[PDB]
Amino acid sequence: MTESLVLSPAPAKPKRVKASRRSASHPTYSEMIAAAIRAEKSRGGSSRQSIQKYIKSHYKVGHNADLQIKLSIRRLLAAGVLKQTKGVGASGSFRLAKSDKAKRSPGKKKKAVRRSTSPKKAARPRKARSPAKKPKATARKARKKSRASPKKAKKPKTVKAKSRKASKAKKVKRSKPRAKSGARKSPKKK
Amino acid sequence: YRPGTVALREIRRYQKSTELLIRKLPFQRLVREIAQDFKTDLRFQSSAVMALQEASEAYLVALFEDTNLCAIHAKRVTIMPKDIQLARRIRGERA
């Protein structure tokens, strides 16, 4: 812990702390890596260049951040807050431990049928003139539970019945007729 | 017949069977070739050639047995030129 490493090069590091103002959302030094982690939007995670780009909006170009990132990753590993994926498909992709619980691997079918219906919902009205409406094709029950038509139909009735506000119920015949009006514009008839 | 697993079938047969694996006369002309440089017109009997062949076969088999264990040591299966270097030197032969 020699002087040429504790006082000679130090002044740069304490001088630049907790000042990532340009990214207003969570500018804390410890939270930049984590903010990149939620912003990545991928199962594998963020690799080195991905995390560097996601952190880089301003205030960060890397005079010493290239090695400071490795040092912070070592600190986060000592804290046990990092979960990652190996392989050459993802060149050291990293994630923060966001309770995305690890479990046994086997049981990976080569399709995702439940989300396979979403692209068709995106495509069909968008291919039509009437743009993609609000997520009304399937309700919140779609990821509440996973059941067939009778159980996915009885529950919306309870959803609407438990909300007994007449004023709230008035909106279902004032926000929906907009679709009826737009059905005149997008197709020429019916 | 997968080539990797068929070789296992050969191992069972060749280990069970007892025979001279290398050709006789090509080995017989081989030992004669070496003798000429050492001593010109050095003759060989039938028994001498077979005795040399059997000793050579056993010596090569033992080296193959040792090099096989060198491959699994390196988390591998096939024999590479590095395997024969480690086995020979560690026996005190190469150096």
Binding site: - | G4, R12, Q15, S17, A51, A55, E65, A71, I72
Partner: protein, 65 residues
């Protein structure tokens, strides 16, 4: 010891194969001899566990190789 191998080998007369088998089987006999060459002795089966891919030849992750 060799004579017992002949019965296991479905043969009456002792062949050089049984001489190797008797010596190799007895570990004490290995110390006495075994750094030698036996004419037509053969080799005892010594298959290693690194071979024989008992697991399915398909890839661990999925069926595709």
């Amino acid at each position: 010891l060799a004579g017992n191998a002949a019965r296991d080998n479905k043969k009456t007369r002792i062949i050089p194969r049984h001489l190797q088998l008797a010596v190799r089987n007895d570990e004490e006999l290995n110390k006495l001899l075994g750094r030698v060459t036996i004419a037509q002795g053969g080799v005892l089966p010594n298959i290693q566990s690194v071979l024989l891919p008992k697991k399915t030849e398909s890839s661990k992750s999925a069926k595709s190789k």
